[PDB]
Amino acid sequence: MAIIKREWLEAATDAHKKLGWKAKGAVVSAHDPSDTGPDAKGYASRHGSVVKRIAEGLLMDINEGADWATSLAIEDGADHYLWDGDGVGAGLRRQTTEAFSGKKITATMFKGSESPFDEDAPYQRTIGDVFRNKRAQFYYALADRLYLTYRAVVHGEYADPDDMLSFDKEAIGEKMLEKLFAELTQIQRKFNNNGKLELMTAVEMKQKLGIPSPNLADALMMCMHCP
Ligand SMILES: [Ca+2]
Incomplete structure (x- = not known):
């Protein structure tokens, strides 16, 4: 039922270097604020088709998390958040x-x-x-x-x-x-x-499979949408 193969991720690692192309397009950043639990917050950023930052936000409340992620977006020169x-x-x-x-x-x-x-x-x-x-x-x-x-x-x-x-x-x-x-x-x-x-939602994944909220994955997913 999994939608992404580990082998695709390995291939995609430095794929732009392997295939000889460069990042072109907008910079898109996204933040997953997690929930009210212990799970880390997420941030992802890409320049066109090249992902350049994946970051975890630890020991933050909701507002600290948003400050953290918006500051990263600024640092990354994001066009869209x-x-x-x-x-x-x-x-x-x-x-x-x-x-x-x-x-x-x-x-x-x-x-x-x-x-x-x-x-x-x-x-x-x-x-x-x-x-x-x-x-x-x-x-x-x-x-x-x-x-x-x-x-x-x-x-x-x-x-x-x-x-x-x-x-x-x-x-x-x-x-x-x-x-x-x-x-x-x-x-x-x-x-x-x-x-x-x-x-599956994070809640369902937690209940059926006992795995923590995938907030890095969700952050990367959200930056697939460019406004
Ligand atoms: Ca989410």
């Missing part, structure tokens, strides 16, 4: 916009439970027929990028860099990259009574 607003982050817009005062950085609340972005467009049968919600939509955007990258790196099959995803291992750091990978391979499909793609 998103954060998970489905839970405890629902009230963070004011603080987030304050943090970005006087800077050209957009702030977008991401709610994974919403119907998919652009749900009436054809799937490439509509996007809304295929994905239950934005959480599924953008995790599969991530999975699709990773698979194309795997096929390019390992099977020599051409793909547009814009449709791939590379992890800049030197920029990210081995330890955090490994933490991210360990979470990504745990993201799982759940049964859906309308035949749509749907993923």
